Assembly symmetry: D3
Homo-oligomer: 71 residues x 6
């Protein structure tokens, strides 16, 4: 499906740390940036994510804050 | 402040659409990637954000989903 | 795209409240239940949402709280 | 308590997956729909949740995205 | 209703800024602390919120991050 | 970094429950109030959090709901 989430960034799985009900997936999205995602193990398995998979980090605009260097 | 948010991505403001109590800030983070942020107008003002300002897109890991084709 | 969001609930748009930068879409998901979604106006336009449109409410499991009668 | 969260959907617990600090509660809300909720084990215990418990899925409007085919 | 949100903080409304579809409510929770809440106008009206109302800031634990001073070297 | 998060509440760590990939940090922020935070174990470690550490509970305004009696 097509989603309203304003942030949908293509990337490659670099690591998967499995937990009890959740795991943490790291995505290399290019330009030297990586995105860490804390999601359910159910989705990590069901999506077939493993190191090297093509995927997207998907983030709703209301979940994204803005910060600055306070110099 | 140093924050627990796993995602702290440097970038430049490319647009700011102001709203009533919130506004939407778009940040170019490089590599052809842009991040859209919906935050309070009060914070857009207090941080002095305008097109061209340096900033960071800050995202908690528990807020990030994974997608595939 | 297939998403990790554990909750993907089919529904019918019943109303759309346009705001300044955000809007609120109400989805009838059947059985007398509706889901309200506060999203960007840009997304409402890009997806072509209108009253009567078929859509899905998408919710990450970590965004869902549980309640009970006390 | 009466909460501002616009989404409050009654349901029946169909499973509870206990984890280390969190667990996952699956609620059948009727009509073939289920809601999965990832919450703290402390709250799962303090709410007395069990399979078969009556409960509610509570979701802030700002946490709900819209999708289309 | 009884909720799983780990954070349920009693306070009194000190201000309400109305927007187009959302508004921002500020709660004095004591100890010199205030909580800002961005929620729908529908809920601000439906809950009868006005300056002086008793209320709660309700926050899921998974929404709360931890910060420390920059001059801390873990 | 200075953050758009409208809520930045100073407090002291009163408990740490370590989990598998997340943990739960509780902060005493004064006035008889405590704030619970579910964050990644990586961040609990990198920030050096232990009982008694000075910290801030950081919360975006759009994550805060309102309740009443
Ligand atoms: O208890 Mo966990 O570390 O969220 O799987
Ligand atoms: O450690 Mo976090 O604050 O869940 O990204
Ligand atoms: O368009 Mo709004 O009411 O400022 O979020
Ligand atoms: O689904 Mo949105 O438009 O990123 O809040
Ligand atoms: O945290 Mo999920 O498994 O993307 O709903
Ligand atoms: O508490 Mo709301 O009005 O669902 O964002
Ligand atoms: O994730 Mo909780 O236990 O509803 O705050
Ligand atoms: O939505 Mo905010 O202004 O980053 O708390």
């Amino acid at each position: 499906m097509k989603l309203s989430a304003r942030n949908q960034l293509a990337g490659k799985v670099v690591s998967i740390k499995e937990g009890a009900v959740n795991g943490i997936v790291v995505l290399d999205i290019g330009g030297g940036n990586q995105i860490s995602s804390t999601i359910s193990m159910d989705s990590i398995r069901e999506l077939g994510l493993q190191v090297g998979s093509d995927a997207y980090a998907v983030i709703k605009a209301t979940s994204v804050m803005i910060g600055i260097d306070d110099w």
